[PDB]
RNA sequence: AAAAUGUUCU
RNA sequence: AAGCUUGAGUCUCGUAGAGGGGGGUAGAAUUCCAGGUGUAGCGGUGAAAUGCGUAGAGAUCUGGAGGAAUACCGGUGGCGAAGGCGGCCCCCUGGACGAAGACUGACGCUCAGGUGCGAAAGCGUGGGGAGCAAACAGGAUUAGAUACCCUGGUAGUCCACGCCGUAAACGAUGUCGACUUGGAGGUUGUGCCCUUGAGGCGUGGCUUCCGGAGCUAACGCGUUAAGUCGACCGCCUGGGGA
């Protein structure tokens, strides 16, 4: 549940802890861990490409199975685990062949529940079938955009995708933003909503928490001098120009998609 | 073990599959030791209005004495299956063996 | 609930009188029976019949002198929510002795006059006029 | 109120029949009722009034 | 004159459309009890049956489709 | 509310002879069992207020029964509570 | 569709 | 201290019900989107204008999306402690009523403090958002019009979990019990009867209307009382201030 902390200190006052006692209180499954070093938001050129990234806490990358290739082999869920690399929780699952894999934990899924991938697999949360097989109406998550590639849509705490239609070889997905999107019906999609939906109710309560997550302080343009950011300078608090990025592009409303390769797939834009 | 008056109408093109489906249902019912007190295939009847987008549908009345779980399963199956268009599980006092 | 039986009985009697009922029946009780007897003695009803073994029904036969009720009024003075006990000196008289006060005394249920004569009083069960 | 003119039948008569059918249905009345929202309370009151009237 | 009562039925059948569609008008509306002279309980049952039929598409909701 | 068979079983357990169904203890058991049955439902359905009202009433009745038992004969009451696992 | 008001005490 | 069965409960079998909670779905309709047909109006009102419309509106057909509410049935009909509860289906679930019988044996009633529920609005977080619609805007009307009318239109209305705790939350009528003339119904049981036919004779539950005695300031109430009494609690003591 969500847990509003008592205000024994300022900083602890506004904290709301999304507690989840079914998560594994211990070291995660070591084979599926790999090293994931932090960037600081810095590319091969060493330059801060993306600002407000750094410090953080050391994290170990969980090799989460987004592809779901183990067709026909059912898998029992061993334990829900904390994944620091995503807002979702990750269920460690034991396939009957012997293999262990992490999956995004769905909403209703928990230790002891069985899951299954492939065409034959039954329609119940955690099961992964091509969207030709999944019925229209369904809330699905971890949806693949290209078949066999890996689930790219709806992986965040409490997200999902409504399958809204199947006009031939393409199913239409009502994405979590509202963007209606044609995806091939051969693309896999894990039944249910990804399950950590109370995640959004967590409030950090202090700057430190943000820092822990890896989020360095964001200085406002307007706070700076003209040389650094368009919203720069002014004796006192001036701001007599239209909101723009640090690189001069308008920020309140100006659409920045210019793909054209994938406009075919976008049925209706989000609004 | 309560009784259930089920009536479901199947897509008219899938009429050839219907008997098989019925059989399967019966098996399921019996799987958890339940009875099937009547089973009337009315066949393709003219609908009063077009459900989904067709004017005829293949009706199947079927009365059961079964547990809850089995009924739930049946319902789920119905929901899944595009062949069946409408189902209507009803609770019924008595076995209601007589013909309609 | 039936939280005063005597009172209820009295009410029934009164209602009978009002509505010209030849008889008035109710669940019998020893106290109730005594009261009935007292009433009979004093002159306000004809006869009482306690009919039954397991569930005895007290059935009072009401009087109607000249097309009107004999029982002019019949009020409980003592009642469960407030009991009224009078000493011999305190003892009441209903309509200056033209009407009776049924009083329960250590030597039986009786009209107030009787009690006075005896040299005692007690729970003034009901004024009957 | 679906109508169709049968073989050898006047127009006026047909129209009349249609009107009758409509009346039976209570279409116009229904429409009127649904022109504006009546508060449930108001509706109840109206019903009560009607009932009272009926008690002649 | 209530027919159901006369018949001696425990419950009206939604499947028996021939009986039901006497008690629904041409447009598809459920006919009043006061008009048909049905008993109140029976009327409710009848209504329910009609509804069921409509759902299953034996009777129509309205005379449009 | 309560299944017939269950009720019968309860009666058998608590009532002295099979037709002894009004016995205070038996009644209490019936109530208690019913309460237990409902507890799960209530947990599932927190906002079902009307149903809860009934449950509350039942509980009250049970309490009353217990009280009645206690004054008449304490030992029996003590036994009964032990049997049921009633707190007090 | 639109139609406000009438000084006090007798 | 011992009992008894009338009060109060329990069990058996049924009964009707928009009782409550959860979940499914159905059709009609409004809205929006896309596409077709088509052309100068549509829309609105008292009349207008704002508004929408030659960029093709409105009308009209097709396909879709969504949300909300459930026509008819529907009824001084029903159920619920009151608030309230209305498509159909399922799962969980509370109560009521009757039929007989069996059992418990006063276990009752009422209840300050306390606890719970409690329309609508409102508030909190997250969803949702068609229609309606405070606020707001414009158009009217007007002497003015911070309104009524029109056009739009946000919060809200919807859902989830909390809080709020009030309403003409009214039957302006506390709860439980008894008793007292009747009629007309409604509703829902049930026993009896050649059902010789939709009927006849009862007996219960709940309930609308009239009306007798009686009560009342009168209005009225009147077997569901505001009659006659009993138990318990609540509340009132001129108006304004408040
Ligand atoms: Mg940033
Ligand atoms: Mg910030
Ligand atoms: Mg900043
Ligand atoms: Mg500076
Ligand atoms: Mg610059
Ligand atoms: Mg300045
Ligand atoms: Mg029930
Ligand atoms: Mg005995
Ligand atoms: Mg509200
Ligand atoms: Mg307006
Ligand atoms: Mg204005
Ligand atoms: Mg809100
Ligand atoms: Mg108040
Ligand atoms: Mg009212
Ligand atoms: Mg009041
Ligand atoms: Mg009257």
Curated annotation (Swiss-Prot), chain B:
Gene (UniProt): rpsF
Gene Ontology terms for molecular function: mRNA 5'-UTR binding; small ribosomal subunit rRNA binding; structural constituent of ribosome
This protein's assembly is summarised as:
Part of the 30S ribosomal subunit. Interacts weakly with uL2 in one of the 3.5 A resolved structures.
Biological source species: Escherichia coli (strain K12)
- GO biological process assignments: cytoplasmic translation
Entry keyword set: Acetylation, Ribonucleoprotein, Ribosomal protein, RNA-binding, rRNA-binding
Query: Any coiled-coil ranges, and where?
Result: none
Q: Which family does it belong to?
A: Belongs to the bacterial ribosomal protein bS6 family.
Q: Which GO terms describe its cellular component?
A: cytoplasm; cytosol; cytosolic small ribosomal subunit
* Superkingdom classification of source: Bacteria
Stated role? Binds together with bS18 to 16S ribosomal RNA.
Could you tell me what this protein is called?
Small ribosomal subunit protein bS6
Quote the PTM field.
5 different forms of the protein, varying only in the number of C-terminal glutamate residues, were isolated. The sequence shown is form bS6-6, which is the longest. The first two Glu are encoded by the rpsF gene, the other Glu are added post-translationally by the RimK enzyme.
Annotated positions of the N6-acetyllysine modification: 93
Q: Please report any disulfide bonds recorded for this protein chain, giving both cysteine positions.
A: none
Curated annotation (Swiss-Prot), chain C:
Keyword list, A-Z: Repressor, Ribonucleoprotein, Ribosomal protein, RNA-binding, rRNA-binding, Translation regulation
Q: Which GO terms describe its biological process?
A: cytoplasmic translation; regulation of mRNA stability; regulation of translation; ribosomal small subunit assembly
Q: Which domain of life is it from?
A: Bacteria
Q: Which InterPro entries match?
A: Ribosomal_uS8, Ribosomal_uS8_CS, Ribosomal_uS8_sf
Q: Which Pfam families match?
A: Ribosomal_S8
Q: Does the keyword Ribosomal protein apply?
A: yes
Offer a single GO CC term for the protein: cytoplasm
Per its UniProt record, what HAMAP family does this chain match?
Ribosomal_uS8_B
Protein family per UniProt: Belongs to the universal ribosomal protein uS8 family.
Q: How does it assemble?
A: Part of the 30S ribosomal subunit. Contacts proteins S5 and S12.
Record's function text: One of the primary rRNA binding proteins, it binds directly to 16S rRNA central domain where it helps coordinate assembly of the platform of the 30S subunit. Protein S8 is a translational repressor protein, it controls the translation of the spc operon by binding to its mRNA.
The protein here is known as Small ribosomal subunit protein uS8
From Swiss-Prot, chain E:
Alphabetized PROSITE patterns for the sequence? RIBOSOMAL_S18
Query: What's in the keyword line of the UniProt record?
Result: Acetylation, Ribonucleoprotein, Ribosomal protein, RNA-binding, rRNA-binding
List the Pfam families hit by this protein, alphabetically. Answer: Ribosomal_S18
What are its GO cellular component terms? Answer: cytoplasm; cytosol; cytosolic small ribosomal subunit
Q: Does the keyword RNA-binding apply?
A: yes
What GO biological process terms are annotated to this protein in UniProt?
A: cytoplasmic translation; translation
Give a GO molecular function annotation for the protein. Answer: structural constituent of ribosome
Keyword rRNA-binding in record: yes
Q: What does this protein do?
A: Binds as a heterodimer with protein bS6 to the central domain of the 16S rRNA, where it helps stabilize the platform of the 30S subunit.
Q: Which family does it belong to?
A: Belongs to the bacterial ribosomal protein bS18 family.
Tell me the subunit arrangement.
Part of the 30S ribosomal subunit. Forms a tight heterodimer with protein bS6.
Q: Which NCBIfam families match?
A: S18
Q: Please report the name of this protein according to its UniProt entry.
A: Small ribosomal subunit protein bS18
Q: Which organism is it from?
A: Escherichia coli (strain K12)
UniProtKB/Swiss-Prot annotation, chain F:
Listed under GO cellular component are: cytoplasm; cytosol; cytosolic small ribosomal subunit
Keywords recorded for this protein, A-Z: Ribonucleoprotein, Ribosomal protein, RNA-binding, rRNA-binding, Translation regulation
Q: Which InterPro entries match?
A: Ribosomal_uS15, Ribosomal_uS15_bac-type, uS15_NS1_RNA-bd_sf
| Gene3D superfamilies attached to this UniProt entry | 6.10.250.3130, S15/NS1, RNA-binding (1.10.287.10)
Q: Name one GO molecular function term.
A: structural constituent of ribosome
What protein does this entry describe?
Small ribosomal subunit protein uS15
Matching entries from PANTHER family are given as:
RIBOSOMAL PROTEIN S15, BACTERIAL AND ORGANELLAR, SMALL RIBOSOMAL SUBUNIT PROTEIN US15M
Q: Which SMART domains match?
A: Ribosomal_S15
NCBIfam families linked: S15_bact (TIGR00952)
Residues in coiled coil: none
User: What role does it play?
Assistant: One of the primary rRNA binding proteins, it binds directly to 16S rRNA where it helps nucleate assembly of the platform of the 30S subunit by binding and bridging several RNA helices of the 16S rRNA. Binds to its own mRNA, stabilizing it 5-UTR and preventing its translation. In the E.coli 70S ribosome it has been modeled to contact the 23S rRNA of the 50S subunit forming part of bridge B4. In the two 3.5 A resolved ribosome structures there are minor differences between side-chain conformations.
PROSITE patterns in alphabetical order: RIBOSOMAL_S15
Note the HAMAP family from the entry. Answer: Ribosomal_uS15_B
Q: Tell me what induces its expression.
A: Part of the metY operon that extends to pnp, also has its own promoter.
Question: Which top-level group of life is the source organism from?
Answer: Bacteria
Quaternary structure and partners: Part of the 30S ribosomal subunit. Forms a bridge to the 50S subunit in the 70S ribosome, contacting the 23S rRNA.
What the record says about family reads: Belongs to the universal ribosomal protein uS15 family.
């Amino acid at each position: 549940a969500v847990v509003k902390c008592k205000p024994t200190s300022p900083g602890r006052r506004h904290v709301v802890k999304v507690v989840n006692p079914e998560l594994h209180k211990g070291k995660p499954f070591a084979p599926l861990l790999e090293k994931n070093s932090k960037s600081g938001g810095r590319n091969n050129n060493g330059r801060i490409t993306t600002r407000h990234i750094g410090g953080g806490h050391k994290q170990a990358y969980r090799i989460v199975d987004f592809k779901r290739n183990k067709d026909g082999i059912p898998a029992v869920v061993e334990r829900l685990e904390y994944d620091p690399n995503r807002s979702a929780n990750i269920a460690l699952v034991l396939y009957k062949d012997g293999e262990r894999r992490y999956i995004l934990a769905p909403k209703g899924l928990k230790a002891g529940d069985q899951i299954q991938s492939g065409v034959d697999a039954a329609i119940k949360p955690g099961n992964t079938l091509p969207m030709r097989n999944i019925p229209v109406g369904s809330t699905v998550h971890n949806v693949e955009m290209k078949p066999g590639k890996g689930g790219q849509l709806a992986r965040s705490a409490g997200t999902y995708v409504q399958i809204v239609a199947r006009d031939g070889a393409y199913v239409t997905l009502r994405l979590r933003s509202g963007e209606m999107r044609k995806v091939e019906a051969d693309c896999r999609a894990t039944l249910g909503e990804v399950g950590n939906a109370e995640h959004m109710l967590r409030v950090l309560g202090k700057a430190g928490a943000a820092r822990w997550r890896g989020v360095r302080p964001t200085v406002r343009g307007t706070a700076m001098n003209p040389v650094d950011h368009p919203h720069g300078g002014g004796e006192g608090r001036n701001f007599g120009k239209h909101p723009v990025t640090p690189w001069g592009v308008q920020t309140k409303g100006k659409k920045t998609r210019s793909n054209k390769r994938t406009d075919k797939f976008i049925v209706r834009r989000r609004s | 073990m309560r009784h259930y008056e089920i009536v479901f109408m199947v897509h008219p093109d899938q009429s050839e599959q219907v008997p098989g489906m019925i059989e399967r249902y019966t098996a399921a019912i019996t799987g958890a030791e339940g009875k099937i007190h009547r089973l009337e295939d009315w066949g393709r009847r003219q609908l009063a209005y077009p459900i989904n987008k067709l004017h005829k549908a293949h009706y199947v009345l079927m009365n059961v004495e079964a547990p809850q779980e089995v009924i739930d399963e049946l319902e789920t199956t119905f929901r899944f299956n595009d062949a069946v268009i409408r189902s209507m599980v009803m609770r019924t006092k008595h076995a209601v063996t007589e013909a309609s | 609930s039936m939280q005063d039986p005597i009172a209820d009985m009295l009410t029934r009697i009164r209602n009978g009188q009002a509505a010209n009922k030849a008889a008035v029946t109710m669940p019998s009780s020893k106290l109730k029976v005594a009261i009935a007897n007292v009433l009979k003695e004093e002159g306000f009803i004809e006869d009482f019949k306690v009919e039954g073994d397991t569930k005895p029904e007290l059935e009072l036969t009401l009087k109607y002198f000249q097309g009107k009720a004999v029982v002019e009024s019949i009020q409980r003075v003592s009642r469960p929510g407030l009991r009224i006990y009078k000493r011999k000196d305190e003892l009441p008289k209903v309509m200056a002795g033209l009407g009776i006060a049924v009083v329960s005394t250590s030597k039986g249920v009786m009209t107030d006059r009787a009690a006075r004569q005896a040299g005692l009083g007690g729970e003034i069960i009901c004024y009957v006029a | 109120p679906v109508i169709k003119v049968r073989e050898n039948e006047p127009f006026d008569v047909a129209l009349r029949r249609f009107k009758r059918s409509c009346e039976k249905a209570g279409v116009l009345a229904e429409v009127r009722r649904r022109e504006f929202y009546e508060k449930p309370t108001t509706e109840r009151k109206r019903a009560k009034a009607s009932a009272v009237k009926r008690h002649a | 004159f209530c027919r159901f009562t006369e018949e001696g039925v425990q419950e009206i059948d939604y499947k028996d459309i021939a009986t039901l569609k006497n008690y629904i008008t041409e447009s598809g509306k459920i006919v009043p009890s006061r008009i048909t002279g049905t008993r109140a309980k029976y009327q409710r049952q009848l209504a329910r049956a009609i509804k069921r039929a409509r759902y299953l598409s034996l009777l129509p909701y309205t005379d449009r489709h | 509310s309560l299944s017939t068979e269950a009720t019968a079983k309860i009666v058998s357990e608590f009532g002295r002879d099979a037709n002894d169904t009004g016995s205070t203890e038996v009644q209490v058991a019936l109530l208690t069992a019913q309460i237990n049955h409902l507890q799960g439902h209530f947990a599932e359905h927190k906002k079902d207020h009307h149903s809860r009202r009934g449950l509350l009433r039942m509980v009250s009745q049970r309490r009353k029964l217990l009280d009645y038992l206690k004054r008449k004969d304490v030992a029996r009451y003590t036994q009964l509570i032990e049997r049921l696992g009633l707190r007090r």
